[PDB]
């Protein structure tokens, strides 16, 4: 929410905001709020099949919501909706390209660096975006 | 679990052992110990019903052995797998006929025994056991 480019703090005001790592087992968990029981009311000696039945529904909505209807435009497309951009006010990713940096190693030629070799990544690349129709007066922005 | 041959009673001995009656509702019934009741712990006002969900699931696992996955072997072939013969040290079943053993009726021809008569059952048959490979040293019984 920071509101200007002062309440950012050395790092990320030079660098940009940090990311979260590639998914692996422990980088992408489940929300850590993510329900691990449902509690139900129940009377004293008895119990509403009726109720636990809307009780489980209830609950799907629920984990639906938690795991990946977080955002309100996720919520509308489970509906079988859409979203324009404008709606919950968000950036349009007009284009999105990727890639792996390879390079090479550079050899050790003297009495002690021979047999030592550095790294020297360096990969040449293209990001093209289509012609694209601004509606609005606004800013085109890529980032890395 | 018999040890030896003498741990073992007149009548099996030398008659062999006792086997099940042709199945048909009280001969082939549902193992005894089989469930008829599965209880969940409840709180005392509340019930996670996420847990009773994994509950049943539990169940399950629980019946599907009860019924028909008490042998490990027919556990395993349940995932899709297989098991050698060696893996639980079963005898190979190499072939299994059987048949209906008729026969015919003798009638009485004297003063007393005309009007009566003798069944004699008398069935031919062949049990025929295609070739078959013998990997190991060891026995091949034929039983009846
Ligand atoms: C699909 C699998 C890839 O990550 C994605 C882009 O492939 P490409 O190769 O950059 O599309
Ligand atoms: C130019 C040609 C198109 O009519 C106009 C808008 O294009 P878009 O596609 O909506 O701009
Ligand atoms: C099938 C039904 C029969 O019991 C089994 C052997 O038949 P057959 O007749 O012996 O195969
Ligand atoms: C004989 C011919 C075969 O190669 C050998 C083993 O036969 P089986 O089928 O694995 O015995």
Avoid at 10 to 38: Q, V
Avoid at 73 to 90: E, Q
Avoid at 100 to 106: H, I, K, R
Wanted: with cysteine.
């Amino acid at each position: 929410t920071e509101a200007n480019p002062s309440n950012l703090n050395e790092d990320d005001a030079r660098y940009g905001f940090r990311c979260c790592h590639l998914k692996n087992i422990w980088s992408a968990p489940l929300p850590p709020e993510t329900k691990l029981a449902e509690e139900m009311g129940i009377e004293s000696n008895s119990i509403d099949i009726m109720g636990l039945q809307a009780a489980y529904a209830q609950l799907h909505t629920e984990q639906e919501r938690t795991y990946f209807m977080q955002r309100y435009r996720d919520v509308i497309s489970s509906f079988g909706g859409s979203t324009s951009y404008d709606a919950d006010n968000r950036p349009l990713l007009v284009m999105h390209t990727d890639f792996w940096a390879s390079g090479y190693d550079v050899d050790g030629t003297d009495q002690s660096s021979l047999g030592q070799f550095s790294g020297r990544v360096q990969q040449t690349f293209k990001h093209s975006v289509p012609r694209f129709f601004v509606p609005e007066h606004g800013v085109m922005m890529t980032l890395a």
